[model samples]
Target chain A: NTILGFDVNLICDFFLNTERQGPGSPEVTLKALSFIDNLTNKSLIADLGCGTGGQTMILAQHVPGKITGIDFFPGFIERFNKNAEKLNLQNRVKGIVGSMDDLSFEKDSLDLIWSEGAIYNIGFERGLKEWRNYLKPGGYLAVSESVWFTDQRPAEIHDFWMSAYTEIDTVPNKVAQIQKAGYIPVATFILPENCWIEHYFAPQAKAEEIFRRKHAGSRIVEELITSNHHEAELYSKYKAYYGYAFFICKKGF
Target chain B: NTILGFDVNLICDFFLNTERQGPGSPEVTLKALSFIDNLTNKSLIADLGCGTGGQTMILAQHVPGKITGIDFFPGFIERFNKNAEKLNLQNRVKGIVGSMDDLSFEKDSLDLIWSEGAIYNIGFERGLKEWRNYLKPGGYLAVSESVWFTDQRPAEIHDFWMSAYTEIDTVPNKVAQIQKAGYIPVATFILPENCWIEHYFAPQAKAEEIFRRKHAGSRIVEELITSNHHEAELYSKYKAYYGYAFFICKKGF
Candidate 1:
């Protein structure tokens, strides 16, 4: 049997409910947050594209503030709510179904806007430039971006990203874009290399293997599984050339 | 009494035969060199813009090969030769007056090419792309470049570089440039923050005070002296946002 018509549903099933929907850990989330100033000042934060609330709860526990974790995917919101409940943070860290493209927050109402590994969903430069009104003057915005660690890599890995992430550039280029987009970059550091292994690739890898076994005769399943594995292998081979880089910035005074 | 229209000569007098014409050190040079492979194979090397041969002599001692140190100014070549003589490396490390814009070496006849804080004169991308023909297959290239450590700084420092060094970007930006220019980056690291202090700033500071004592009446002299001091002071303030980064690369196979 073919699973071609169910590819989107299969993808949703593959990522239905998990602690993370991206390559980041709680430690890294906190590390990115640490760069912000005045975080404990009863700050109002909007965690844009906060898939599964993996980092949202951490933000709530670390800083004395209210956080609204926003994502359009209902399943992701469900997962986020469950995680928030497990952490007993549902009161402080609320999950809402919303699109990052059209944020509903009042202008200049927020003190911080934090997004881990999801700014690309709204577009990197646009998110930095367009989201400034959401932050009060002197407020902070932190996000993780995929950046080129090296300038060039083997075509196998290079081509993978060309199709997957054409916006990828070196860290400095991203920083310049941030400054040009009306924010001041405060600090930047690469996410731990194992962020890929532990949070992202590890879970997907096991699931891919199981899928291959369960649907050995299905071409759609086989191709999907191989593509997922191919991404993991490419990251392993060319980790130095590209990675998730956390950028911490402040709204220009 | 005024340095006046003779400021160029005065500036040369201030730097003539000085061990350093810019900020950088032997340790940083060697640290960058350690990233290359097969350096002990009697490789042929070129040190472009080898001001005063301070780093060139260190290169000779560290690597098992001859080094041809090239520069445009006759005074710089004289200073370089004096340093080479003092180090007793006159045979292995020779100084020659040559324009970096038009190099004299034969194509593919070199095993290594090194430059220290000087590639900006030839432009960063053009130098990397143009110099590749000088390297044999698998040969190494090492150079130091000015880069942004942080993404933003006070407008004074930011504006100073905007006029002075329009090419400056972040470390990874330069690495991407290196790779885009047909080489593979092996390693990259920033020159220590003190590099600006020890090699460039301290001497100018001492000379500035003495010049003020002897030429207090010369507004032109005072202005030039203060301009020189201004560069160093700005570096100290914004070093975290910008730096001289060493890049090591190999001619790709």
Candidate 2:
């Protein structure tokens, strides 16, 4: 299956070495974190779908808690662990290879579950429904998902998003689903345009060039890069219509 | 008191000759109308804070109803009436000099109350609460509001908006207030960037020049124009943070 217009393996390879795998920044991550009420030294946090721990590292520095970074790719987990060690956070921050579809965390074990721009992997509704079991009562869940800025958008971007991820929806509907999944919609915010232009797509240019050179004249690599470029182009034209929205929720039981 | 960074009279004078008084287009207006159900020959509609009948004319053409366009400025009402005459809709559409704060419509009389980018005059919460009494049990309220796309925005834009209109808020908060004001939130959508840049601000450039020529060497006029320009500049830079959102609500009794 594809993840954001690229095959899952190809996406992993393309974003393995990048600082971030999606559109987000350190400031936005911390801003989402600021809403969680009871994070403490004994708090257990998990960064599901944490590719290379880009946001996880920033999250780890701020919260005084043990963080477990989970990813489906071994390469990403290795890099995540090395990055954690480099920051001397190896004791508190660790990375493991796993699928979000079947998280290994025990029920009621987590104080907070954080996912940045990656919840679309298992679908927004399913992720929220299944992940709640891992969180203790009143635990917080912070995630950023692709959201339509408007209920009506041009057909070009709408078709593109539907093919990329059918679960993409407006913020109100997403908030309603969060409520239906048994969480109080504590806060929701749109990521600034710079997160897509500056943090995500701009950084991919050099990576794309290096990728093309390493796999010279490979049509598959060219197609992947071309798809990525087209996605960026669509965003530039339709940024007003769609972008990632950070949703902060609390388990209400 | 000022309205959207300019004195109320100044705003009316500057926008009287323009087709629209705010950041909206005919297409967006009709799109909002598509959400409301039950309109017929007997329907009684009112366009609150309607300026020059830009959107009211469009509404009148689409639905089989008698429309009353209300505005505080007599000059706008005169122009609104002339425009209706020019379009030969004078019989079905009429303009009246009135304030939204004390609308003269009988309680439970209106089938649809439409307001485009003008509800901030009475404040969103106050307008929603006060206006609901005029609508029948199942009547619809379609209004466009200035809404923050994100909860946290840069201090510059935040301060500018707060000073301009303290009622400006995020969409979720606005939706919650709609629910609290006793209406079911049917639809909410962000107006595209072109509505602000192309339809509103860009059109204002020629108007601004004409305005300057009409009142040359007036410092007050210059300050007003400069404030408008600054507002436009900030929107260009920080538009990712905020924009106008059309909220469609159905009265639920």
Interface Cα RMSD, each model: 5.8, 9.3
Model 1's C-alpha root-mean-square deviation from the true structure amounts to 8.7
| Model 2: CAPRI class | incorrect
Question: What is the C-alpha local distance difference test score of each model?
Answer: 0.76, 0.84
On TM-score, the candidate that comes out on top is 1
lDDT for predicted candidate 2 compared with the true structure: 0.84
What tens-digit string does per-residue lDDT give for candidate 1 at A1-253? Answer: 0233465545555665233566888777876775565776477999998877777878888898889989877767787898888888888789898888888799988989888878887788889878888999778888888877555467877787779877777766786687676665555566666688888788777676666675567777777777877888888888756788777776865
> Candidate 2 residues A1-253, lDDT tens each?
2433444556567777465677998877886886687799999999999989989889888888999999888778888999999999999999998999998789999999999988999999999999999999879999998887555679999999889999998667787788678776655666766788788889887688888887787777788789888998999898867788788877865
Write model 2 residue lDDT over B120-192, tens digit each, in one string: 9999999999999999987989999988765466999999988999999867778778766877665566676
Model 1: per-residue Cα lDDT over B6-125, one tens digit each: 555555556652446676887778767755666765778999988667788888878888889998766667878888898888878889988788997999889999998899999999
RMSD of each: 8.7, 16.7
Model 1 ranges off by over 4 Å? A1-10, A16-19, A208-224, B1-253
TM-scores computed on chain B for all candidates: 0.89, 0.94
Q: Candidates' DockQ values?
A: 0.10, 0.03
Alpha-carbon runs more than 4 Å astray in model 2: A1-11, B1-253
